Amino acid sequence: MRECISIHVGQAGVQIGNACWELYCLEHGIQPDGQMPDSFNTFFSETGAGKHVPRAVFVDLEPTVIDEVRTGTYRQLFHPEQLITGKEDAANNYARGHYTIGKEIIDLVLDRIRKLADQCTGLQGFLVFHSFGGGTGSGFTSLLMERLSVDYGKKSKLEFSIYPAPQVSTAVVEPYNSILTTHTTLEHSDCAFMVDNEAIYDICRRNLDIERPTYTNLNRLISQIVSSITASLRFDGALNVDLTEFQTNLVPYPRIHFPLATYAPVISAEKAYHEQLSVAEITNACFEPANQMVKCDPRHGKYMACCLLYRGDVVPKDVNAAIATIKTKRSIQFVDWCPTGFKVGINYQPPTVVPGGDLAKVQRAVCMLSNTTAIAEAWARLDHKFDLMYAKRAFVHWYVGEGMEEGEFSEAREDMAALEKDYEEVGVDSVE
């Protein structure tokens, strides 16, 4: 009676979402056919026959990666009305996925969402899975977040934004996609989650002992972070937290709403032994600079609000014990205006593992969603990957020729440079 629905904009979302709904079927016994040999009605709307179909609208300009969904293992699951394809891609061009091509098929998208807002007496939230890297995932979302908010206004709209790495990038015009797609989403985003690839590659290397991680393997990890934020709807633990509750705990201001996620424990099959992973052990595994899944040093800024979405057999005495250690430790700093900034959530589900995966079978886990000041320095970086590629006026000629003003780039930057001092608004201490 509480129902959330999911959109998959761009390539980076759809390939993740192929592993998300791979993972939801493991926690419920759902076949690829929709068969199964009642609280899971949050992500399904079943048929009179024995069949469950998910609440998913896979949308893509390029017709490429959708075709592997229609031929894959999950052919017999999704409704073929959902899988909206298109003619040509935006092709890493914000001025094409928002003005030229994505403007065309947007009525086919909003109407198939419209036929899913009626099967839900308890419509709860949105899930736009997208990247800041591409052109579809950054252009079509900025179109789509404006349209669902004018439609509804009063629903939670959680994104899962792939953040662009400080050092490794597979795109050349990537700082032109990101500065546009944050300015456009900023009025209409509600709580935008950050994930970087580069920080996962350490966690793929060190803690997992894998030197060759495929995009099969990186998208297993980001699926488990998704499969534990949404664990307090599908199941009931001692302390459940809804998507309407995250937006008030984690978010101090209408601007600063960028949590970075951290999951623990992440250890291999062989190193699954040799330690015990207690409820006070796995908590310290989250507040390291090593385990942050965004490449930002968390010791260069304060934590404003954390949220420890525990699961598995965790007994709530030790959480209060473990937190009382952490607030007393030295390098971990909290902000002078926040007294104590946590939000504990215990659920009664062990994190189940996908077969053919590379994580251990653990009995407890934690999906930390920790807002901070440390991400502000990366916002002092993507403007510097922006100004050098703009003072010589490089790459402007593909965006002018697709319906975008010249002045509506420096308009975004000064709005983005205003977002920088709002973290400096946080870092000061208004004493007396």
């Binding site: 400080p166 050092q167 320095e377 002092a380 970086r381 510097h384």
Partner: protein, 110 residues
């Protein structure tokens, strides 16, 4: 006795200035290295991507080509391996004899 003069000449002329585009620029700094007797030279980049901008020297820190720096404005520490010929990072933070290069804050450039 000891110095770092053969190391930095091996590091300037072969890693970050070895292209023939900056070949007049390499000669415009090579003649400013032979005219000093500093026992410890050091290189300051701007980015983590180690774009070369200024040459310095250390005493057991003046601008050979900010003029003076302290131990607060330092962020990363680079060590130039002659094996790989690539500036590798340093887990240690003390400015010492093995420390070949470093970075500073982005506050100092805006």
């Amino acid at each position: 006795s000891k110095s770092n003069k053969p190391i930095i000449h091996n590091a300037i002329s072969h890693c970050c200035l070895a292209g023939k585009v900056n070949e007049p620029h390499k000669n415009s700094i090579l003649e400013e290295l032979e005219k000093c007797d500093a026992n410890h030279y050091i290189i300051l980049f701007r980015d983590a991507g180690c774009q070369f901008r200024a040459l310095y020297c250390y005493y057991p820190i003046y601008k050979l080509t900010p003029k003076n720096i302290t131990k607060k404005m330092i962020d990363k520490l680079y060590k130039y391996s002659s094996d790989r010929k690539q500036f590798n990072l340093i887990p240690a933070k003390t400015m010492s004899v093995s420390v070949d290069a470093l970075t500073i804050h982005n506050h100092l450039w805006q």
